[PDB]
Design an enzyme around this catalytic site. Structure first.
Site, PDB file in Angstrom:
ATOM      1  CE  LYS A  21      24.088 -40.023  -2.712  1.00 37.43           C
ATOM      2  NZ  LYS A  21      22.862 -40.205  -1.903  1.00 37.43           N
ATOM      3  CG  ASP A  48      27.381 -37.201  -1.698  1.00 36.51           C
ATOM      4  OD1 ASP A  48      27.751 -36.076  -1.302  1.00 36.51           O
ATOM      5  OD2 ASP A  48      26.183 -37.568  -1.658  1.00 36.51           O
ATOM      6  CG  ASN A  93      24.743 -32.023   2.936  1.00 37.78           C
ATOM      7  OD1 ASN A  93      24.606 -32.545   4.042  1.00 37.78           O
ATOM      8  ND2 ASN A  93      23.750 -31.395   2.322  1.00 37.78           N
ATOM      9  NE  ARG A 123      21.232 -34.553   5.344  1.00 35.49           N
ATOM     10  CZ  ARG A 123      21.629 -35.387   4.395  1.00 35.49           C
ATOM     11  NH1 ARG A 123      22.692 -35.124   3.640  1.00 35.49           N
ATOM     12  NH2 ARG A 123      20.941 -36.513   4.196  1.00 35.49           N
ATOM     13  CB  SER A 168      17.999 -41.430   8.245  1.00 34.64           C
ATOM     14  OG  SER A 168      18.838 -41.811   7.157  1.00 34.64           O
ATOM     15  CG  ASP A 312      17.008 -39.791  -2.850  1.00 37.51           C
ATOM     16  OD1 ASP A 312      16.563 -39.115  -1.904  1.00 37.51           O
ATOM     17  OD2 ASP A 312      18.151 -40.301  -2.845  1.00 37.51           O
ATOM     18  CD  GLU A 340      20.919 -34.625  -0.438  1.00 35.29           C
ATOM     19  OE1 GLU A 340      19.881 -34.929   0.200  1.00 35.29           O
ATOM     20  OE2 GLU A 340      21.582 -35.470  -1.075  1.00 35.29           O
ATOM     21  CG  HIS A 384      22.176 -33.878  -5.710  1.00 33.21           C
ATOM     22  ND1 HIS A 384      22.262 -35.234  -5.963  1.00 33.21           N
ATOM     23  CD2 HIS A 384      21.770 -33.763  -4.420  1.00 33.21           C
ATOM     24  CE1 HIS A 384      21.900 -35.904  -4.881  1.00 33.21           C
ATOM     25  NE2 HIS A 384      21.587 -35.031  -3.934  1.00 33.21           N
ATOM     26  NE  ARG A 385      18.647 -37.559  -5.311  1.00 33.14           N
ATOM     27  CZ  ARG A 385      19.335 -38.256  -6.203  1.00 33.14           C
ATOM     28  NH1 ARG A 385      19.125 -38.083  -7.495  1.00 33.14           N
ATOM     29  NH2 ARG A 385      20.239 -39.123  -5.798  1.00 33.14           N
ATOM     30  CE  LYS A 410      24.992 -34.283  -0.880  1.00 32.02           C
ATOM     31  NZ  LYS A 410      24.482 -35.648  -0.649  1.00 32.02           N
TER      32      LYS A 410
HETATM   33  O1  LIG Z   1      21.371 -45.274   2.085  1.00 26.11           O
HETATM   34  C1  LIG Z   1      21.395 -44.591   1.091  1.00 26.11           C
HETATM   35  O2  LIG Z   1      22.198 -44.800   0.207  1.00 26.11           O
HETATM   36  C2  LIG Z   1      20.448 -43.506   0.946  1.00 26.11           C
HETATM   37  C3  LIG Z   1      19.359 -43.511   1.720  1.00 26.11           C
HETATM   38  C4  LIG Z   1      18.236 -42.518   1.631  1.00 26.11           C
HETATM   39  O3  LIG Z   1      18.159 -41.751   2.846  1.00 26.11           O
HETATM   40  P1  LIG Z   1      17.075 -41.962   4.049  1.00 26.11           P
HETATM   41  O4  LIG Z   1      17.265 -43.367   4.559  1.00 26.11           O
HETATM   42  O5  LIG Z   1      17.428 -40.910   5.060  1.00 26.11           O
HETATM   43  O6  LIG Z   1      15.728 -41.746   3.394  1.00 26.11           O
HETATM   44  C5  LIG Z   1      18.400 -41.632   0.396  1.00 26.11           C
HETATM   45  O7  LIG Z   1      17.542 -40.492   0.451  1.00 26.11           O
HETATM   46  C6  LIG Z   1      19.841 -41.203   0.231  1.00 26.11           C
HETATM   47  O8  LIG Z   1      19.978 -40.264  -0.829  1.00 26.11           O
HETATM   48  C7  LIG Z   1      20.699 -42.417  -0.056  1.00 26.11           C
END
Ligand SMILES: O=C(O)C1=C[C@@H](OP(=O)(O)O)[C@@H](O)[C@H](O)C1
Length: 426
Positions: A21, A48, A93, A123, A168, A312, A340, A384-385, A410
């Site tokens: 993804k 997604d 989402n 979020r 993030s 994750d 999520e 999903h997780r 997702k």
């Molecule tokens: O950049 C990405 O592809 C992701 C970054 C992560 O988020 P955070 O940077 O908020 O931890 C991860 O949890 C998300 O599922 C995918």
């Protein structure tokens, strides 16, 4: 809706992973911006990615999809995304659509509203909005500062901006992918600690594949030159999803047998390949190849680890801990709360239903397994997780019932069928 998983006596076999993804949505956006036509192979078909594809279509990007939606030929715009219409784009989402598109649509003079499902409006995005506004973007937070929905009216120039890294990495990722096309150079100073650093590495690898480099000064300052254009690499192979792989590797660690996953290996750009090291630390045996990772069961013992590098895949350790001797502690995972669902609350609540004793810290979780697991219906919080992590409870003498199992779509619509293919029921 619910799915009851009957007790599984053994798992073994080989799983050909669906596409990543994280890679899929970066590659789609970069291909849409780039000069030339990019052919993506092993693209993920999941919610997604579909939301990204739909947004790109609505914004006038020309692409074709194969029948199975895993091969995508994208005619690049050779510049920023542009629409003359006052659109509203629904992004589900999907953080990897909402954050990157919020930044990308700050280039130029569009007038676009980005929104999503109720949880997406809960979020955070303010750290990204703040940096974009510092660089000249006109943004309105239509309901509350720090959250979507957002109205983007363009004007990002570049310059000296600050982005908070503490909530993030997706905010920095979004800025990095947009800045090369801005009219001025951008100097990004990181405020605070940077979480989820391996996802920044994914972004930088993908940008380099599409012909753009930046100066990463110890993850504390990034220098990006403006006035650039992405260049199509031609063919691009999307790696298999290392986060999706975690469930099958853990299943092998718990109830194998040997479970091999293909499409990722020792040189993959995704940080979640490092999940396999945790299984090895717990006592499973892990074998590596250029295009596989395999895990064979051994006696499992608990770990106490900082999981900020694999937030994750770390969720998979939380349920794998039910099968390990001792108390497992997963640290430095505060942003579980803003994903999520609030995953610290959710994981603790559902683990207790199967009998675990759980200490839910502000930014950590401590899990003490029961002597025997208990039957539960597991709420999945439209996450999903949660569904995929709790599937592992059935690698025991106890079934598990997963509520709303289709939430796996997702990132992994066919998860349960793929698990069944390697499962032998007791
Ligand atoms: O950049 C990405 O592809 C992701 C970054 C992560 O988020 P955070 O940077 O908020 O931890 C991860 O949890 C998300 O599922 C995918």
């Amino acid at each position: 809706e619910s799915l009851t998983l009957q007790p599984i006596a053994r798992v073994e076999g080989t799983v050909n992973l669906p596409g990543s993804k994280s890679v899929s949505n970066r590659a789609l956006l970069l291909a849409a911006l780039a000069r030339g036509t990019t052919v993506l192979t092993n693209l993920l078909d999941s919610d997604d990615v579909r939301h990204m594809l739909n947004a790109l279509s609505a914004l006038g990007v020309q692409y074709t999809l194969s029948a199975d939606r895993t091969r995508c030929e994208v005619t690049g715009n050779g510049g920023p995304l542009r629409s003359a219409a006052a659109l509203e784009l629904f992004l589900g989402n999907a953080g990897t659509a909402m954050r990157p598109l919020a930044a990308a649509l700050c280039l130029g003079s569009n007038d676009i509203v980005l929104t999503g499902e109720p949880r997406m409006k809960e979020r955070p995005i303010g750290h990204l909005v703040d940096a974009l506004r510092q660089g000249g973007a006109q943004i309105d937070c239509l309901e509350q500062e720090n959250y979507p929905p957002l109205r983007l009216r363009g004007g990002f120039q570049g310059g000296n901006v600050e982005v908070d890294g503490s909530v993030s990495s997706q905010f920095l990722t979004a800025l990095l992918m947009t800045a090369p096309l801005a009219p001025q150079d951008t100097v990004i100073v990181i405020k605070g600690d940077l979480v989820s650093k391996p996802y920044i590495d994914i972004t930088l690898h993908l940008m380099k594949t599409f012909g753009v480099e930046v100066d990463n000064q110890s993850y504390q300052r990034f220098v990006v030159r403006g006035k650039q254009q992405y260049q199509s690499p031609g063919d691009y192979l999307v790696e298999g999803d290392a986060s999706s792989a975690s469930y099958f590797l853990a299943a092998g660690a718990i109830k194998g047998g040997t479970v091999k996953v293909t499409g990722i290996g020792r040189n993959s750009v995704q940080g979640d390949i490092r999940f396999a090291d945790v299984l090895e630390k717990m006592g499973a045996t892990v074998t590596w190849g250029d295009d596989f990772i395999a895990c064979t069961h051994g006696e499992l013992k608990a770990v106490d680890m900082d999981m900020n590098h694999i937030p994750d895949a770390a969720m998979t350790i939380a349920t794998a801990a039910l099968f390990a001797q001792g108390t497992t502690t997963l640290r430095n995972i505060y942003n579980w709360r803003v994903k999520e669902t609030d995953r610290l609350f959710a994981m603790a609540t559902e683990l207790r239903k199967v009998g675990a004793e759980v200490e839910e810290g502000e930014d950590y979780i401590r899990i003490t397994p029961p002597a025997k697991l208990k039957y539960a219906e597991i709420g999945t919080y439209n996450d999903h997780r949660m569904a995929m992590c709790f599937s592992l409870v059935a690698l025991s003498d106890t079934p598990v019932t997963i509520l709303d199992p289709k939430c796996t779509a997702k990132t992994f619509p066919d998860y349960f069928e793929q698990l069944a293919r390697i499962s032998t029921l007791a």
